[PDB]
Design a protein around this ligand. Structure first.
Ligand SMILES: *[C@@](=O)([C]([C][C][C])[N]C(=O)[C]1[C]C2=[C][C]=[C]C(=[C]2)[C][C][C][C][C][C][C]C(=O)[N][C]([C]2[C][C][C][C][C]2)C(=O)[N]1)C(=O)[N][C]C(=O)[N][C](C([O])=O)C1=[C][C]=[C][C]=[C]1
Ligand SMILES: [Zn+2]
Ligand SMILES: [Zn+2]
Lengths: 16, 151, 22, 181
């Protein structure tokens, strides 16, 4: 199987 | 908006991956030798340092790479899968103490996440929580130098 | 002369955040 | 928490020019550091304790465009190489450092924070030397201590062969004396 990306985190808290 | 940290999952578990120097690194105990999914099909690992519990694939879409630390600070910060920040005092080459211990559940699913210095730069990748009666009081981590050596 | 104009911003107060999806 | 930063462009070339002349800016302000421009050069400005400070070699004696038309400088100190206007409405101010740390972090116009080792009241050295081109446009940016407090404002790069190895800054103390002037 594959590792799938389910979400993301932006360390700067940058919007949009 | 691009993210440096990806929240990943396999059929078994969920953990984190951190992009550093163009590579998406994570823990071997989570990814194993699994390939990563993309809109064009599975992409194979560029590195698989089983010895260091380290694997890396080419950085995916919607990500941006983090910069390795160069200030040699011991005042580290752990980012969890919930975006929580946890101050960790570096005790050694790959060990650090949480300034305030939390139940292992608070650090649950964050392996692969990054250990940052006062400047937000990558110090290491969170490898494993050091528990004592279900309370995480310290953490094991893969120094950025190892990632830099593996590549 | 003309006035100094704000053409952008840099924010230091942002904390890690899970980028919202659809 | 660690120091993190992000950049956002709020205006373009033509809108910048029109705004420079008109002196009227209706855009909303956010952040503690504003990316700033004149028709000649672009630099940074930092809000500390309610005042938007910047580098005199960039702002000169100019007014700053605001929703109420141009605003006259509150402080001008050619020697200290400083200028200050009331901090724009919407901005967030940084607070001066109260821990005299020698480990400083420079925030560039690209929203990067680089470690800087204090070597004097107005000098510090780059741990990771970068080419001055990368520092271009950052004069007026903040030099933060580990607690995210203003220690100084970037002023000039100390470089050789095109590589910046150190930086000269305006320590926060100069701000208090300049205001007193
Ligand atoms: C800042 O205004 C710049 C950025 C530095 C790289 N700083 C300067 O231009 C300063 C001005 C200055 C004048 C007198 C005295 C001092 C500073 C400081 C006292 C001690 C000086 C010790 C070092 C000697 C020195 O003067 N160094 C120069 C340096 C020398 C190598 C080349 C670069 C300059 C110095 O730092 N002088 C800023 O970032 N804004 C200017 C700018 O470039 N703006 C824009 C534009 O539109 O022109 C720009 C933006 C993005 C890319 C390119 C250009
Ligand atoms: Zn660092
Ligand atoms: Zn301080």
């Amino acid at each position: 199987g594959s590792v799938v990306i389910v979400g993301r985190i932006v360390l700067s808290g940058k919007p949009a | 908006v691009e993210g440096e940290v990806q929240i990943v999952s396999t059929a078994t578990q969920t953990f984190l991956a951190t992009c550093i120097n163009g590579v998406c690194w994570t823990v071997y105990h989570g990814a194993g030798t699994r390939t990563i999914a993309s809109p064009k099909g599975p992409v194979i690992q560029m590195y698989t340092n089983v010895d260091q519990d380290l694997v890396g694939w080419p950085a995916p879409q919607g990500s941006r790479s983090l910069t390795p630390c160069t200030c040699g600070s011991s005042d580290l910060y752990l980012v969890t899968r919930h975006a929580d920040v946890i101050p960790v005092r570096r005790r050694g080459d790959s060990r650090g103490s949480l300034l305030s211990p939390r139940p292992i559940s608070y650090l649950k699913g964050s392996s692969g996440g990054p250990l940052l210095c006062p400047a937000g730069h990558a110090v290491g990748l969170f490898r494993a929580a050091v528990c004592t009666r279900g309370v995480a009081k310290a953490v094991d981590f893969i120094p950025v130098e190892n990632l830099e050596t593996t590549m």
